[PDB]
Amino acid sequence: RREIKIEGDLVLGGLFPINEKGTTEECGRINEDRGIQRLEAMLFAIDEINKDDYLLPGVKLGVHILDTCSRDTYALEQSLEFVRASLLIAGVIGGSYSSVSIQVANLLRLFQIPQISYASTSAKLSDKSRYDYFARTVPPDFYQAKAMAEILRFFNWTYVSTVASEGDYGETGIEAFEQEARLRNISIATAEKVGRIRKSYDSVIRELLQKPNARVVVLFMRSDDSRELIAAASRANASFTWVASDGWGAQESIIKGSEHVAYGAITLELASQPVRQFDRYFQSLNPYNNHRNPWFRDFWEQKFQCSLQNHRRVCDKHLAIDSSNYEQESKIMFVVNAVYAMAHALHKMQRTLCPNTTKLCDAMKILDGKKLYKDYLLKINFTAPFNDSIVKFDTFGDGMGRYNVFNFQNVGGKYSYLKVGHWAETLSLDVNSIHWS
Amino acid sequence: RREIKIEGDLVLGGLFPINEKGTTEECGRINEDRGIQRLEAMLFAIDEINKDDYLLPGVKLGVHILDTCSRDTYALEQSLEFVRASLLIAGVIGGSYSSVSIQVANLLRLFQIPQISYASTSAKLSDKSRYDYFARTVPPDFYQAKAMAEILRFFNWTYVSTVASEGDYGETGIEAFEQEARLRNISIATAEKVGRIRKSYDSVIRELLQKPNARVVVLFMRSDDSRELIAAASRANASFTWVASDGWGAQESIIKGSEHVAYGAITLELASQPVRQFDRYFQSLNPYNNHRNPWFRDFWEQKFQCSLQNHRRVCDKHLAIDSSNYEQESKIMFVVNAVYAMAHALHKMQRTLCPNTTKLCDAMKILDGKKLYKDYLLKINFTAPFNDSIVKFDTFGDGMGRYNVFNFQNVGGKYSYLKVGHWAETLSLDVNSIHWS
Ligand SMILES: N[C@](CC1c2ccccc2Oc2ccccc21)(C(=O)O)[C@H]1C[C@@H]1C(=O)O
Ligand SMILES: N[C@](CC1c2ccccc2Oc2ccccc21)(C(=O)O)[C@H]1C[C@@H]1C(=O)O
Ligand SMILES: [Cl-]
Ligand SMILES: [Cl-]
Ligand SMILES: [Cl-]
Ligand SMILES: [Cl-]
């Protein structure tokens, strides 16, 4: 029922997991980082573009923002509002979960509405024919498989074993790693999978022990699966050199109480830099100055376990989002770059189709989505506005594969993940900073 | 803007090409046979089912009927009305043109709404994964390719040449014939195509003459392409034994003025029988008793070139649809069988999910479209209501491939197409009635 509907000459649709997938109820609690923060980054980006005197000087961007409630079917129903509009919906920003972005993309292509996801990393969305109106500022996860294969090939690690989670993430990732290993003459000792139980991980650990020549284990697993496998490795006192995808990444929750077996592990994470101006914008928001966001009062009441309006404690008027209770969500840069990619494509389109004017001409009021996607959006190339990193898409509409390389080690009586490298198209490692086990 | 919206316990969506694809304007003239007649066959079928005391005894069927205007994009926009409904839209009947049914099917699968086409014959719609909510009472055209290959194999015609129209119909049909010929050890001399010009056909005829050993020509062409190729064959005085798909069929317009070169031609047509009770129902309709159809007054004014309400002649009050100006459209049986297939699937579903009641229970008010399609609709098997011919679908949702075999000949100083056989799964020919050339 809730929405953010702001008028403009051109309107961008937005889809965010503002609320978690509910349990009795369809929608759960507010999602603070993937929902509120990401939605406010798109509003921040719109405000900035509208303020800019060089980008779309005569065209004001409006918005139509909706909650996906972290569910495919709910997001599809919401997306009908963007299709009914045929508000001048020029394109859609979102969603977050790949399963939501797949269903939205199946609908939007039918009405030729371009879509840019700032978070969906499934390999399926790369399909030029099935998702011919979809683009993304994030790279697909199959580039992690390529980056891991390139890390092994560098260290000449020719004999390895693999563990994968069940589902799109784990299966597609190890299937891509298997192919990337074959091309690099890397032989896979044993390939294990993990379904949806404590014993299951011990069966995998035992099966990994059956090939003692393969000291390197390559993981393409979800967070919970990664923690549980390292726990079973801890129980069996089985120490391996783990090479893992972002499912493990640089999360301290994974290695907690199992740092011996997990020592020297090589992990990947999506490389991103914070948007400093966003921290200032987000920390200044309060229930008194943020009337345009209809979810903000529930976000505030939930974040601070208080009531703004008697069994509930009254919100102290001096509460604030600040350094002690806030950290910029890892994908804020991708939200901002997605909105700017749409603006840059629209700007170039208006300049070509509306000669000798800055205003939105008739040729663009009857907007050709096919032209916008193929001839403008897929051909954008600009410097990220708050970074010199380039925003651009390949012919599949995929953003550039840039990952940080981490090494789990202890220096100065503290266990931390250390940034020991980066993968862009070529691997770059600071080898003399890596610890082994 | 116009529609037929009739309330019921369960409502069926309907899509018909009531108006032709417009030219200035988006929608053209009324389409009398594929539009008005086919829409009235669905209303006839609904009335009959509702009157029946054994089929859905406690569930009244309603309708929501819309004009596709013979265009993909217009039909997609119309279909949003069936999706917005989530009226209790249980399923959709239509469309006619395969291009319209493809776009509708792309939308309806997303909201799990089963769809039955009474006319769309494209091979694409057979795809179990891409069109997983689509079924049809007509067979796909690739069964014509199989039937023609079986006619050649019977007469031991091992050396043949092929001509195909450009587009889905001709290309897919000859591609399927090429595969069906390989399996029957039939060698193809030359494979010609026809684009979108009088000279083009002469180039094909000349190229066919280059292989004089191949006296049999297999055609998979559109009506206009078929007439023009027989015209070029007439000009080059090139007489062949033509084996053609329903694009030519038993149309006298194809052979007009070119009966010598076209003599003895073997052609296919979709086998159908008229629904006798429909003739009585359709011929009784007049502008005074048909208020539920909002397009009928324009149909009447167009059919009779008159005005019901001064430069226009006033409609004579004694005008009527009758034997002199009406003939039952060839696919009326498929419209009626599509509506009955949906009713039978709903009837079996209500009997299983609503025990000890005939009424629509809560388990069916929140209708599971996935169950309706896979467990009920794909498993129907009933005698056609106004025929003993069986209505059933295969695992792809395709209706049974039943074609009549025609032979163009002269008997008693009159040129006519004679029914000389039938193809169901096995070919059946009355060989001693076939003329050659
Ligand atoms: N990138 C996500 C997550 C990504 C993923 C991709 C496809 C399927 C499953 C799947 O689950 C995992 C599990 C572990 C690590 C990464 C993923 C996406 O759903 O695409 C998106 C939720 C993330 C966000 O909103 O930041
Ligand atoms: N069966 C049709 C027509 C069928 C066809 C199928 C796919 C592509 C093109 C194509 O065009 C031809 C040409 C000649 C003969 C048969 C077809 C369909 O569009 O499916 C549908 C309009 C017919 C109806 O409403 O009766
Ligand atoms: Cl989402
Ligand atoms: Cl998954
Ligand atoms: Cl149609
Ligand atoms: Cl065609």
From Swiss-Prot, chains A, B:
Glycosylation site positions: N156, N237, N356, N381
One term under GO cellular component: postsynaptic density
Major place of residence: membrane
MF-aspect GO terms: calcium channel regulator activity; G protein-coupled receptor activity; glutamate receptor activity; group II metabotropic glutamate receptor activity; scaffold protein binding
Expression by tissue: Detected in brain cortex, thalamus, subthalamic nucleus, substantia nigra, hypothalamus, hippocampus, corpus callosum, caudate nucleus and amygdala.
Extracellular side stretches: 1-437
UniProt keyword list: Cell membrane, Disulfide bond, G-protein coupled receptor, Glycoprotein, Membrane, Receptor, Signal, Transducer, Transmembrane, Transmembrane helix
Disulfide bond annotation, renumbered to this chain: C27-C69, C306-C315, C354-C361
One of the GO BP terms on file: G protein-coupled glutamate receptor signaling pathway
Cellular compartment(s): Cell membrane
UniProt-annotated binding residues for L-glutamate: S98, A119, S120, T121, Y169, D246, K331
Subunit relationships: Interacts with TAMALIN.
Family: Belongs to the G-protein coupled receptor 3 family.
Function of the molecule: G-protein coupled receptor for glutamate. Ligand binding causes a conformation change that triggers signaling via guanine nucleotide-binding proteins (G proteins) and modulates the activity of down-stream effectors. Signaling inhibits adenylate cyclase activity.
Protein's name in the database: Metabotropic glutamate receptor 3
Organism this protein belongs to: Homo sapiens
Lineage: Eukaryota, Metazoa, Chordata, Craniata, Vertebrata
Gene of this entry: GRM3
